[PDB]
Design a protein around this ligand. Structure first.
Ligand SMILES: CCCCCCCCCCCCC/C=C/[C@@H](O)[C@H](CO)NC(=O)CCCCCCCCCCCCCCC
Length: 231
């Protein structure tokens, strides 16, 4: 499909940069910590527009990276966990693992409602060596599409989001979900697409990202509990 090169560039950039430890960078601040979930943000505002890169890490017992990515990507289960949208639909299927999605978000007062149009791709990155972890990644990044032009009711946000998963399995005869731990890195780089009050945007991000990470990961645990493991 026409976006294959763009997908590869986006995936490679995440694998090169998004897994780099930000812990030693004074510009990256821990904003939320609960259990194994840590949420960090770098405050960035250019021409009044809040761009604050967000990075979270989590460690989720009893689920695999393949499972987590499947649930994050699969549009059929989207409304079971997502809480920030008014509607979404699939604009185009590019491949078995790549779709283009249009969605409108819930309005955050006092700003205009935001919409987004993004390619969502799920990819397995095989281990190259014995000690290299296998990675499952979902990348959601803005693309243009003639069937979803700009409209007069919403401001079009631009996003680059990834959910990046590596799975640790402890030696057991068969593997139990008690033996598996999914290490998650989630990154979100969002351009709100126009002015919005900085304090409001930052408060909403601080609330909504951990709320999502907790809700979504608990959902995957709930939906996979008692079921055969999909590695
Ligand atoms: C009632 C709350 C309404 C919030 C509306 C925020 C609109 C901001 C622009 C779009 C944000 C992109 C969210 C990414 C979505 C997809 O990758 C995916 C599937 O939907 N979900 C997540 O990654 C899970 C993402 C969950 C967290 C999203 C919260 C973002 C808040 C940002 C700060 C407020 C921005 C409002 C602009 C005026």
């Amino acid at each position: 499909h026409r976006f294959v090169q763009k997908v590869e560039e986006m995936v490679q950039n995440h694998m090169t940069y998004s897994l780099q430890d930000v812990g030693g960078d004074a510009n990256w601040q821990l904003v939320v910590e609960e259990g194994e979930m840590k949420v960090y943000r770098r405050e960035v505002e250019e021409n009044g527009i809040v761009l604050d890169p967000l990075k979270a890490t989590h460690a989720v017992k009893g689920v695999t990276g393949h499972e987590v990515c499947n649930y994050f990507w699969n549009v059929d289960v989207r409304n079971d966990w997502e809480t920030t949208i008014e509607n979404f639909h699939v604009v185009e299927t590019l491949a078995d693992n790549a779709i283009i999605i249009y969605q409108t978000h819930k309005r955050v007062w006092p700003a205009s409602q935001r919409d987004v149009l993004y390619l969502s791709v799920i990819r397995k990155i095989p281990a190259l060596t014995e000690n290299d972890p296998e990675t499952w990644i979902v990348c959601n990044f803005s693309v243009d599409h003639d069937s979803a032009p700009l409209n007069n009711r919403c401001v079009r946000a631009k996003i680059n989001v990834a959910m990046i998963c590596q799975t640790l399995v402890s030696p057991p005869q068969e593997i139990s979900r008690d033996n598996i731990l999914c290490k998650i890195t989630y990154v979100a780089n969002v351009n709100p697409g126009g002015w919005a009050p900085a304090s409001v945007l930052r408060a909403v991000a601080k609330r909504e990202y951990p709320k999502f990470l907790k809700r979504f990961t608990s959902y995957v645990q709930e939906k996979t509990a008692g079921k055969p493991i999909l590695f």
